[PDB]
């Protein structure tokens, strides 16, 4: 995951409110979470990948090995079972909870890290640049 490692800052977000609605996030959390401009810090140590998100809304940190399911409490307080894999150089992060599923894809495009969050037919695209 060499191309992903570093410190990234959110610079643009499209359709994130609609994505959060589809996920089931409530009004007040959607409003405050949508304002946030997080710094995402990605690091690798051996087989272990760590993704931290620091923001004024809620700090999160996940560590994982590709292909190996883990427990995650999301920033909006869902308790989900997550599996992250690499698919053709794209990090694919599937979250399962309450019979529902959402997929977050992270990919390098030019000097940006593009995050696509998909819930059924609703996609949000969030673009990060190096800090
Ligand atoms: O990283 C991105 O830009 C991304 F946004 F694509 C993403 F994070 F991958 C994500 F939206 F998919 C996700 F993980 F937050 C999530 F899985 F959707 C989620 F579970 F966090 C969520 F989006 F569903 C949420 F929890 F509902 C949320 F609303 F809280 C939030 F907005 F995403 C948020 F809280 F995480 C935040 F506001 F975005 C934040 F700024 F607080 C931050 F946690 F720092 C973060 F943005 F880094 F997430």
UniProtKB/Swiss-Prot annotation:
<dbReference type="GO" id="GO:0015909">
    <property type="term" value="P:long-chain fatty acid transport"/>
</dbReference>
<dbReference type="InterPro" id="IPR000463">
    <property type="entry name" value="Fatty_acid-bd"/>
</dbReference>
<dbReference type="GO" id="GO:0045892">
    <property type="term" value="P:negative regulation of DNA-templated transcription"/>
</dbReference>
<comment type="function">
    <text>Lipid transport protein in adipocytes. Binds both long chain fatty acids and retinoic acid. Delivers long-chain fatty acids and retinoic acid to their cognate receptors in the nucleus.</text>
</comment>
<dbReference type="GO" id="GO:0050872">
    <property type="term" value="P:white fat cell differentiation"/>
</dbReference>
<protein>
    <recommendedName>
        <fullName>Fatty acid-binding protein, adipocyte</fullName>
    </recommendedName>
</protein>
<dbReference type="GO" id="GO:0005737">
    <property type="term" value="C:cytoplasm"/>
</dbReference>
<dbReference type="GO" id="GO:0042632">
    <property type="term" value="P:cholesterol homeostasis"/>
</dbReference>
<dbReference type="GO" id="GO:0005829">
    <property type="term" value="C:cytosol"/>
</dbReference>
<dbReference type="GO" id="GO:0005634">
    <property type="term" value="C:nucleus"/>
</dbReference>
<dbReference type="InterPro" id="IPR000566">
    <property type="entry name" value="Lipocln_cytosolic_FA-bd_dom"/>
</dbReference>
<feature type="short sequence motif" description="Nuclear localization signal">
    <location>
        <begin position="21"/>
        <end position="31"/>
    </location>
</feature>
<keyword id="KW-0007">Acetylation</keyword>
<dbReference type="GO" id="GO:0005324">
    <property type="term" value="F:long-chain fatty acid transmembrane transporter activity"/>
</dbReference>
<dbReference type="GO" id="GO:0005811">
    <property type="term" value="C:lipid droplet"/>
</dbReference>
<keyword id="KW-0813">Transport</keyword>
<dbReference type="GO" id="GO:0009617">
    <property type="term" value="P:response to bacterium"/>
</dbReference>
<dbReference type="GO" id="GO:0051427">
    <property type="term" value="F:hormone receptor binding"/>
</dbReference>
<feature type="modified residue" description="Phosphoserine">
    <location>
        <position position="12"/>
    </location>
</feature>
<comment type="similarity">
    <text>Belongs to the calycin superfamily. Fatty-acid binding protein (FABP) family.</text>
</comment>
<dbReference type="GO" id="GO:0050873">
    <property type="term" value="P:brown fat cell differentiation"/>
</dbReference>
<feature type="modified residue" description="N-acetylcysteine">
    <location>
        <position position="1"/>
    </location>
</feature>
<keyword id="KW-0963">Cytoplasm</keyword>
<feature type="modified residue" description="Phosphotyrosine; by Tyr-kinases">
    <location>
        <position position="19"/>
    </location>
</feature>
<dbReference type="GO" id="GO:0071356">
    <property type="term" value="P:cellular response to tumor necrosis factor"/>
</dbReference>
<comment type="subunit">
    <text>Monomer. Homodimer. Interacts with PPARG.</text>
</comment>
<feature type="binding site">
    <location>
        <begin position="126"/>
        <end position="128"/>
    </location>
    <ligand>
        <name>a fatty acid</name>
    </ligand>
</feature>
<dbReference type="GO" id="GO:0120162">
    <property type="term" value="P:positive regulation of cold-induced thermogenesis"/>
</dbReference>
<dbReference type="InterPro" id="IPR012674">
    <property type="entry name" value="Calycin"/>
</dbReference>
<dbReference type="GO" id="GO:0036041">
    <property type="term" value="F:long-chain fatty acid binding"/>
</dbReference>
<keyword id="KW-0539">Nucleus</keyword>
<keyword id="KW-0597">Phosphoprotein</keyword>
<dbReference type="GO" id="GO:0005504">
    <property type="term" value="F:fatty acid binding"/>
</dbReference>
<dbReference type="GO" id="GO:0050729">
    <property type="term" value="P:positive regulation of inflammatory response"/>
</dbReference>
<dbReference type="GO" id="GO:0015908">
    <property type="term" value="P:fatty acid transport"/>
</dbReference>
<dbReference type="InterPro" id="IPR031259">
    <property type="entry name" value="ILBP"/>
</dbReference>
<dbReference type="Pfam" id="PF00061">
    <property type="entry name" value="Lipocalin"/>
</dbReference>
<dbReference type="GO" id="GO:0071285">
    <property type="term" value="P:cellular response to lithium ion"/>
</dbReference>
<dbReference type="GO" id="GO:0070062">
    <property type="term" value="C:extracellular exosome"/>
</dbReference>
<keyword id="KW-0446">Lipid-binding</keyword>
């Amino acid at each position: 995951c060499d191309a992903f490692v570093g410190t990234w800052k959110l610079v643009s977000s499209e359709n994130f409110d609609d994505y959060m609605k589809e996920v089931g996030v409530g009004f007040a959390t959607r409003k405050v979470a949508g304002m946030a401009k997080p710094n995402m810090i990605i690091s690798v140590n051996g087989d272990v990948i760590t993704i931290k998100s620091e923001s004024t809304f809620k700090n999160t940190e996940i560590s994982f090995i590709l292909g190996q399911e883990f427990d995650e409490v999301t920033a909006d307080d869902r308790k989900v079972k997550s599996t992250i894999t690499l698919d053709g150089g794209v990090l694919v992060h599937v979250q399962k909870w309450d019979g529902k599923s959402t997929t977050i894809k992270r990919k390098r495009e030019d000097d940006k890290l593009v995050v696509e969050c998909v819930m059924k037919g609703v996609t949000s695209t969030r673009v990060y640049e190096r800090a």
